[PDB]
Amino acid sequence: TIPHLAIDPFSLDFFDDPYPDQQTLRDAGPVVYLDKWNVYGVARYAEVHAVLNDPTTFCSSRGVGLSDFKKEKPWRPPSLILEADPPAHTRPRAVLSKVLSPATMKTIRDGFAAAADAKVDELLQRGCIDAIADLAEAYPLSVFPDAMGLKQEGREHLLPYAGLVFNAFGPPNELRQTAIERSAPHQAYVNEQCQRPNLAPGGFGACIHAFTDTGEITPDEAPLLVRSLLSAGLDETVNGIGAAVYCLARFPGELQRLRSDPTLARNAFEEAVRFESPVQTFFRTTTREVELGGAVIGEGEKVLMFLGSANRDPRRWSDPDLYDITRKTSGHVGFGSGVHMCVGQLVARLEGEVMLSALARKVAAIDIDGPVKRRFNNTLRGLESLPVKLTPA
């Protein structure tokens, strides 16, 4: 009653062009079985949204990667928020929600917008730039580590640790195993910076340690919570920003609309998060036998959610393969949905908005002038290189 498919969603062939295989997954049925890794798969919007919003049946405490924590040991101590279920998840989630609150955004918006304007001006002086290394990567590195309160030394570990974390959500393929092989230096840097003395006052990390006085987290819980903000946030925002630039270059009509109304910058980034979905997939584990879309799934089974596919499901979106900066994007699952829906989504939207705004006001044309190269990751979708010409407005 369940179609069995041989598609490997963690193969380089799939990473190169996942959209045809995603339709095959959506059109085979609401629930598929992937014989390659012995997991259930859901690629339609309705089933992805259903799973994300039933955390009791589809839990996260047994890991949101392929590995089942009841069967194998986690490659690192489990995150206190991503890899936790209610009620254990609730109080750590509330701390990160207050640390990255709408009120917190007010204290950092002017500095984030200034660095974005300054980077665009710098790149306009060069003309031909790599929109990944020089823009998508450079800008978040120039605002987020300082907003965390991280010292200057050792910041070169942040990007490799981010790519390791998301590679480790995948199956034990070469991408995952080679990432873990090289992980020891990045783990040691990240864990050390999580200690309260190493986090500058006023920053995100120091604000997490300050919540230990309230009874929501204990002092021994703070370093792991800080670790969450050194694991998530970086590569997703880089990939999302890089995808928005790529879209603005592939769809010149949308850049012209953004230039004419720079207040569309926020929705232009949100639509890029839907169009690209920097986080393509992750897992849940069933805690009981469950019927999902006419399919009986046993207890203790891994369920693979295709976020990017759900964001392009024609059963939910009109013209999903088109980048439309005025699209009603509310309801996309690029940030997830339910109790685990990205706690840093306000930081990501701010970073994306102020960068697209700086582009909207200072740039007249964005033209690809070189070979585009993909960056391969078991969980993340994004570009390795995007050579573009920036024409000043």
Ligand code: HEM
């Ligand atoms: C374009 C940018 C981003 C995307 C696409 C993204 C994506 C996601 C998704 C899909 C989830 C849900 C995971 C799940 O349900 O299992 C999530 C959770 C999370 N994200 Fe993001 N994220 C982004 C930016 C950020 C930023 C900037 C931060 C921190 C500053 C961050 C930190 C977190 C954390 C800590 C969680 C776990 C929340 C929880 O378990 O309740 N993310 N993210």
Ligand SMILES: O=C(O)c1ccc(-c2ccsc2)cc1
């Ligand atoms: O270290 C953490 O707490 C953490 C790590 C990864 C994610 C994430 C985001 C989209 S898929 C998985 C969330 C939180």
Ligand SMILES: [Cl-]
């Ligand atoms: Cl670690």
